[PDB]
Design a protein around this ligand. Sequence first.
Ligand SMILES: Cc1cccc(-c2n[nH]cc2-c2ccc(F)c(-c3ccc(S(=O)(=O)CCO)cc3)c2)n1
Length: 229
Amino acid sequence: THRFVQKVEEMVQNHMTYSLQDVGGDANWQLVVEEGEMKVYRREVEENGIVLDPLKATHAVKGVTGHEVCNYFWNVDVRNDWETTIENFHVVETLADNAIIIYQTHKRVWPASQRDVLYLSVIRKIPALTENDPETWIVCNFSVDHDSAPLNNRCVRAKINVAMICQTLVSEISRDNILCKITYVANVNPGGWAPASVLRAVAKREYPKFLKRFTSYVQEKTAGKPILF
Ligand SMILES: Cc1cccc(-c2n[nH]cc2-c2ccc(F)c(-c3ccc(S(=O)(=O)CCO)cc3)c2)n1
């Protein structure tokens, strides 16, 4: 039992309560980009001059399970196969077999300075709320403080709360008959000065490119392997 067990429970339950809700019907969410079943939405939010724009996306991916998608998203050993904006990353602390603390730096977005981030990354299976409902696999990545935080004078420290939340629908089961329903939420505080139009333009381009590249990577690596439910 590590020191972040309560915090983890809170952050995960908040996503389970609030992040799964539908936004198709909700005019407070702007639909920014659509590519088939991938639907990317945002709200435009600025606090004390800093652009926070909550991002929420849904997607439906054939032929992979939620457990698989979450394992690929959490497993630091495959990070470089799908990430494209990371410059450096270091595992700061191992809390449990399902929870680590990561420090990473990102590629600069001109003309703002580079960003770094220091977060707890946890993977959990959440049982079905009623006998009717699906089980959920979730990865939550959320900023924390740590005394071994790196000094990096080129970087402004962002703060994140991200979740990759998956429910899996199925019909001996073939990958032909499985579909993973994803909700991805990203609440990024850039942590200092950054021009709003540029941040918005980069979010609009990069979030869809990330979701497409990541989800296709999982399909590619699990093809012709036995399913892990
Ligand atoms: C996916 C995406 C969308 C929009 C912009 C960018 C980007 N381009 N250049 C710098 C960044 C940047 C700056 C600060 C950050 F915290 C993250 C950040 C993004 C996602 C996540 S995660 O938790 O989804 C995946 C683990 O990295 C963590 C940090 C990314 N990347």
